[PDB]
Symmetry: C2
Subunit: 216 residues, 2 copies
């Protein structure tokens, strides 16, 4: 257990991550890239320095079954990482980069399935371009200004999201639980919603979007 | 006022209609074709004989501002007739033929209007193919099996209709009042309902049609 430490400008080595538990630590301008962080747990840790605007690098990391609770991951570069089973709970993740990250188990050449547990996070302006998070737990996040271009979230629980005006047409949402979400601008003529779950109170806005007038 | 008279096999001439009013009459195998019936009034009259299965011909009639109230117009041939302002209320009109009939004042598509007052009628298996009936009073009718192919009902009050499984994609319904109508199989991706009025209780079936799952 590593606690209450401040690391500044550190290029970490594999040996430094061995105990795999961090609590109340500050990581300022640190590089974890291409290291094995599988099963590591971080609680109440900062990876972003407000004053210097320094962020951390986690490019190509093994993050499989890593967990982050109440961390500040603002601007963290997690691109190209292995993220099967990754858990992010209640994190500040403004501008987090997951481009080219996998959340999948490529079990054979023919088959894969995804797993991820991402809840209560601020993913405002995050980069999830091209990412597959299918049949994952993705509920109760904020996604305002996030890049979901070419992503597939098919079959995932996205209940209780704060979306804002997502480019709905460029993300696969088939089978998604979209209950208790704002869906502004979502045009059912341009977006496949097959198997999507909604509440009765979301019906009117979808129909008004395509020109219907709904009376009591 | 011509009252409780029976006419059979009769080829009518124009003079026979100067007494513009008829009540409780029967017309069995009668021909009104190419006559001016403008502003004529028929109440509780029959134009169709059941045991005989004989119907009447009204081909190319001037039926403008004419009125039929609680009349049996089953199988009547009104093809090619002028019907601007025609009123049919609470008529039995199974199989009525309005092929090539006009309900419009349309010299050009740049400025025109339609008019018709067709309410409470049984239009089961009626032929309205290609008819322009826009912004007309068309409420409370039964349309089971009617040919509406190429018809435009845009802007009309169709509230309280019994439609059945209409070919929705080949009739113009934009701006229509469809409150209290059955809309079975109406697929929003294929059918433009811009400006259409519906009630809250009609939303779920429309959205379920395109694959959404609606919860309380």
């Amino acid at each position: 257990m590593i606690k209450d430490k401040c690391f500044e400008g550190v290029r970490f080595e594999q040996q430094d991550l061995e105990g795999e538990q961090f609590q109340g630590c500050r990581f300022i301008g640190c590089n974890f890239s291409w290291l094995d962080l599988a099963e590591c747990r971080f609680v109440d840790c900062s990876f972003y320095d407000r004053e210097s605007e320094q962020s951390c690098l986690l490019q190509g990391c093994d993050l499989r079954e890593a967990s982050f609770l109440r961390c500040d991951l603002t601007m963290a570069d997690c691109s190209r990482s292995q993220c099967l089973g990754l858990e992010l709970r209640d994190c500040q993740a403004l501008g987090i980069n997951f481009s080219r990250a996998s959340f999948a188990n490529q079990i054979t050449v023919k088959s894969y399935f995804c797993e991820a547990h991402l809840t209560g996070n601020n993913f405002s302006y995050a980069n999830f371009e091209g990412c597959l998070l299918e049949q994952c737990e993705l509920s109760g996040n904020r996604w305002q200004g996030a890049n979901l271009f070419g992503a597939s979230l098919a079959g995932s629980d996205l209940s209780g999201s704060e979306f804002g005006q997502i480019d709905w047409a460029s993300v696969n949402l088939q089978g998604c639980d979209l209950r208790q979400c704002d869906l502004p601008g979502l045009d059912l003529r341009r977006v496949n919603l097959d198997g999507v779950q909604i509440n009765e109170d979301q019906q009117q806005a979808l129909l008004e979007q395509i020109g219907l007038i709904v009376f009591p």
